[PDB]
Design a protein around this ligand. Structure first.
Ligand SMILES: *[C@@H]1O[C@H](CO)[C@@H](O)[C@H](O)[C@H]1NC(C)=O
Lengths: 441, 49
């Protein structure tokens, strides 16, 4: 039997319902999400890391001159400094005082740290949404499986065929561009490959961490060597990767809405409490029992003995009953007013049973379904003591949940007073108009 | 669970109350004063004899 419904996209809060099959006693169904994962499709754009400046030995040409040539090296620089007179431990290196030339070379390459300390720039698009579900039905204990939240791929869980519909919202915490550094994800609009600027995040860009083609854009300028010293001085803008690491700011892990948790393998947002999830589960036929084969429950009376509209199961109720065959009986509240903790109870020939529930309503009024029967529970609830709790609420608050009987009385008095007073004016007008008409006639 | 109340300043007369904690059965509480002492601060001015 196929049961179709919509459950909220809340991890850790179970969805409870009764599977009502004509001719068979209702079968209690419970579906709980273990986790929800939004797995976008990612494409690695390039890898950024701190640059290393490689400086080959300068060519010191005594009594002559040399000329620089271009080379296929990232940010390659070459400048010929004429009129050098270098000295070393062995004295004057060259004889000629002026016809003396030093050729300096420098180029940028990936630092050794780039193998471990680097940022990955990813292009992010929409993708698969997956979830893990925990399901029970009838006497069958908990079963779980990983399913695709797409509304097309069925999953076999405990011989039950479950279809999970697409999320009601396409919202995702990742922008079209993300930067993955370590365990953190940043919604950073990184510059495109080949357009990075010196001192900024993209100053050094590589398609892969092992790529032989490196793009480097730093103001690498060769400076004239100091008088008499053989060295290759240079000026360069500080690495933009270190600057970004200082200014990277708050990662998406800390600012993602809806409490999403960000994971990197694969990149995904977990447990985002967004929208609702349509579902469809086919309960095995063997799980259903005929009405005449189940105990019949009658003479139901529900008394709420305690109630607090706390996030936990702060309510307690006692249900008196009479039943035949003294068997087990599913318990469920189809109304959203209160969520019942117990799923089923053991019934005797006569007696009473208790159950716990959580509700936000100051005056709960909900229908409790007892296998083949139903009863209405009413009561009053006190405010909770704890201002702050470390656990999510088990119930859903409604617009009218906070309206007390006193507030309803005042609302009825105000609305009825104004309505009746206006109606009085209208009736008086019609009556006097008719009186004038009969004055003429 | 904190229970707050006002008891009379009487010695030998116990204060009785039920500590009602939401969701738990009430716990009987009995507070009795054995003695009360007002101990002012004193400065010896002088000794006469
Ligand atoms: C399903 O819920 C039951 C509750 O007793 C728990 O023992 C089980 O571990 C849950 N399933 C998963 C996959 O965590």
């Amino acid at each position: 039997y196929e049961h179709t419904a919509v459950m909220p996209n809340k991890v850790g809060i179970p969805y409870k319902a009764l599977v009502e099959r004509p001719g068979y006693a209702p079968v209690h169904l419970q579906i709980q999400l273990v986790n929800t994962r939004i797995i976008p499709s990612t494409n690695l754009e390039y890898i950024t890391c701190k640059y290393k400046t490689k400086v080959p030995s300068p060519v010191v040409k005594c009594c002559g001159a040399t000329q620089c040539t271009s080379k296929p090296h990232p940010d390659y620089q070459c400048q010929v400094f004429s009129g050098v007179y270098p000295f070393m431990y062995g004295g004057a290196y060259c004889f000629c005082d002026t016809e003396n030339t030093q050729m300096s070379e420098a180029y940028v390459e990936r630092s050794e740290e780039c193998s471990i300390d680097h940022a990955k720039a990813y292009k992010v698009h929409t993708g698969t949404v997956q979830a893990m579900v925990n399901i029970t039905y009838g006497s069958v204990s908990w079963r779980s499986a990983d399913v695709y939240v797409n509304g097309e791929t069925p999953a076999k869980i405990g011989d039950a065929k479950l279809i999970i519909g697409p999320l009601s919202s396409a919202w995702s915490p990742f922008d079209n561009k993300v930067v993955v550094y370590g365990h953190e994800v940043y919604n950073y609009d990184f510059p495109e490959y080949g357009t990075g600027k010196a001192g900024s995040f993209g100053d050094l860009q590589s398609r892969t961490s092992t790529s032989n083609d490196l793009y480097a854009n730093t103001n690498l300028k060769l400076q004239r060597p100091q008088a008499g010293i053989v060295h290759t001085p240079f000026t360069q803008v500080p690495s933009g990767f270190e600057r970004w690491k200082k200014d990277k700011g708050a990662p998406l892990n800390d600012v993602a809405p809806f409490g999403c948790s960000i994971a990197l393998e694969p990149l995904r947002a977990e447990n985002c409490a967004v929208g609702s999830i349509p579902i469809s589960i086919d309960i095995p036929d063997a799980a259903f029992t005929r009405i005449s084969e189940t105990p019949t429950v009658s003479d139901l009376e529900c008394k709420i003995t305690e109630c607090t509209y706390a996030f936990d199961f702060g309510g307690i109720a006692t249900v008196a009953y009479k039943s035949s065959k003294a068997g087990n009986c599913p318990i469920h509240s189809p109304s959203g007013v209160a969520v019942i903790k117990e799923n089923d109870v053991t019934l005797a020939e006569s007696g009473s049973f208790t159950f716990h529930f959580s509700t936000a309503n100051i005056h709960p009024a909900f229908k409790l379904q007892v296998c083949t029967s139903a009863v209405t529970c009413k009561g009053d609830c006190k405010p909770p003591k704890d201002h702050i709790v470390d656990y999510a609420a088990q119930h859903t608050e409604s617009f009218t949940s906070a309206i007390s009987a006193t507030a309803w009385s005042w609302i009825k008095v105000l609305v009825g007073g104004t309505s009746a007073f206006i109606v009085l004016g209208l009736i008086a007008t019609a009556v006097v108009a008719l009186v004038l008409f009969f004055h003429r006639h």
